[PDB]
Amino acid sequence: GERKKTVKGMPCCWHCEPCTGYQYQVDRYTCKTCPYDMRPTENRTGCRPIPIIKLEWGSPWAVLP
Ligand SMILES: CC(C)CCC[C@@H](C)[C@H]1CC[C@H]2[C@@H]3CC=C4C[C@@H](O)CC[C@]4(C)[C@H]3CC[C@]12C
């Protein structure tokens, strides 16, 4: 769940830094950027649907109506 370990001139030892928040560790060397249709979960690998909210009957801004 943490990509972009960039290899130096020698292809043996790498430095690992976090990718972007909206990006993924889908592959070892690819940040996937899962689309806006669904939000990253706790682990940065694998997409997860966004929770949905609606007009709640107990909404504080729906008392006077
Ligand atoms: C007492 C209730 C059930 C009926 C009468 C409600 C009337 C008086 C209206 C007039 C203005 C209204 C408030 C206007 C704005 C807010 C801020 C919001 O973040 C929570 C609800 C709250 C606090 C409303 C509550 C209901 C309210 C006080």
Give the topology, please.
Blueprint: E1 5-7, E2 14-16, E3 38-40, E4 47-49
Antiparallel strand pairs: 1-2, 3-4
The site of cholesterol has 4 residues, from loops.
- In percent, how helical is the residue content? under 10%
The ordered string of helix (H) and strand (E) elements is EEEE
User: Strand order, biggest sheet?
Assistant: 1-2
Helix count, DSSP H or I runs of 4 or more residues? 0
Largest sheet: 2 strands, antiparallel
The counted number of beta strands is: 4
- Cofactors and ligands: cholesterol
Rg from alpha-carbon coordinates: 19 Å
Q: What general form does the structure show?
A: rod-shaped
What distance lies between the first and last C-alpha atoms, to the nearest angstrom?
46 Å
Subcellular location: Cell membrane
Disulfide bonds: 19-31, 34-47
Family: Belongs to the G-protein coupled receptor 3 family.
Glycosylation sites: 43
Notes on the structure:
The structure is cut from a larger assembly and holds one chain. The chain contains no helices and 4 strands. The radius of gyration is 19 Å and the shape is rod-shaped. It starts with a strand and ends in a 16-residue tail after the last strand. A two-stranded antiparallel sheet has the order 1-2. Strands 3-4 form a two-stranded antiparallel sheet. The protein has strands at 5-7, 14-16, 38-40, 47-49. It has 65 residues and is mainly β. The structure holds cholesterol (CLR). Belongs to the G-protein coupled receptor 3 family. Disulfide bonds join 19-31, 34-47. Glycans are attached at residue 43. This is Metabotropic glutamate receptor 4. It is found in: Cell membrane.
